[PDB]
């Protein structure tokens, strides 16, 4: 928990205040552009269900992955920035992203 982006944002967003979460992905796009993926390419989710959608374009994403030396309370993350297609599972009305399935 020492000032790279992942350590800072995992703490701020309440993911690592009470545990170290092994992996998390942050999407640097507007909320409505990420919500727009729920009407883009329909694909199967990893679990087999079919309410997943893949973005037509790549999006700016930061992957945060715990190091092999990370132990609560001192969570530590390797930060990887990339531009990738995101795959989200969608539910509700309005039909909105509720789970991040993958980036490709």
């Amino acid at each position: 928990s020492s000032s790279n982006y992942c350590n800072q944002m995992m703490k701020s967003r309440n993911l690592t205040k009470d545990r170290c979460k092994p992996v998390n992905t942050f999407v640097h796009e507007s909320l409505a552009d990420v919500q727009a993926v729920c009407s883009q390419k329909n694909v199967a989710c990893k679990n087999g269900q079919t309410n997943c959608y893949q973005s037509y374009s790549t999006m700016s994403i930061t992957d945060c992955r715990e190091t092999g030396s990370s132990k609560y309370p001192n969570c530590a993350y390797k930060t990887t920035q990339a531009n990738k297609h995101i795959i989200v599972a969608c539910e509700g009305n309005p039909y909105v992203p509720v789970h991040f399935d993958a980036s490709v």
Binding site: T25, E29, L31, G92, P97, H99
Partner: peptide, 15 residues
Amino acid sequence: KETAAAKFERQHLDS
């Protein structure tokens, strides 16, 4: 409390 859609935004969006 927090809906599933709200949790997705808190955990994964950084606009």
